Every structure is written in structure tokens, then in C-alpha cells.
């Protein structure tokens, strides 16, 4: 009645189900991937507050 993504809906004449804008949607796994973190700089983790 809504069809999978291989085959269209049968009881609805010209409808197939809407595609995704993101495939992998858990980006806590993407940003911890070795492909990503091979490429990053380093965190810059001082504060450098105002100096009198």
C-alpha cells in the first residue's frame, strides 16, 4: 500500500516511498570514525582569558 524502495506501491498507482537525505544518521559514530579523525587538526583547548 506504500511499497518498499525496490518496488512501488501496488494499491497506489504512481507512488514510491520517499528517499533519504541522510543514510547513516547517528553522527556520534561518524565523527569518531578513523577516516574522519585521521584528518582533523587537534582540539585547541586553552582559554586565553583577558590579561591585565
Amino acid at each position: 500500500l506504500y511499497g518498499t524502495w525496490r518496488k512501488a506501491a501496488s494499491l497506489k498507482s504512481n507512488y514510491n516511498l520517499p528517499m533519504h537525505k541522510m543514510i547513516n544518521t547517528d553522527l556520534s559514530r561518524i565523527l569518531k570514525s578513523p577516516e574522519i579523525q585521521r584528518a582533523l587538526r587537534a582540539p585547541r583547548k586553552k582559554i586565553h582569558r583577558r590579561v591585565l
Binding site: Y2, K12, Y15, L17, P18
Partner: protein
């Protein structure tokens, strides 16, 4: 009384919203965070047999 009371939505958006309305009723977090106390229930797309 000739105010435009009634609104059109083109039907691929009606079917877009009805696939997004069914797919969130399978995630236990979204259906419990709408308030439905679904703690003790088993498997989230509940299917009882056709004898019901």
C-alpha cells in the same frame, strides 16, 4: 462568509507526512515521549492476529 476556510495540500505531501507519521510510531522513544505509557507492552509495532 467567503473567507478561505479550506486548504489544499498536494497529495505527495499528504503521503509524505503519513509515512513519517507511521515510522515514528515504531520508535519507542517518540511514542513514549508523546505520553503513551508503553512501558510494559511488548514489541512496538504491536500485531495481534486477525482473529481480533
Amino acid at each position: 462568509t467567503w473567507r478561505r476556510w479550506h486548504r489544499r495540500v498536494n497529495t505527495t505531501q499528504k503521503r509524505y507526512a503519513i509515512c513519517s507519521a507511521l515510522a515514528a510510531s515504531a520508535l519507542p522513544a517518540l511514542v513514549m515521549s508523546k505520553g503513551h505509557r508503553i512501558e510494559e507492552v511488548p514489541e512496538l509495532p504491536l500485531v495481534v492476529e486477525d482473529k481480533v
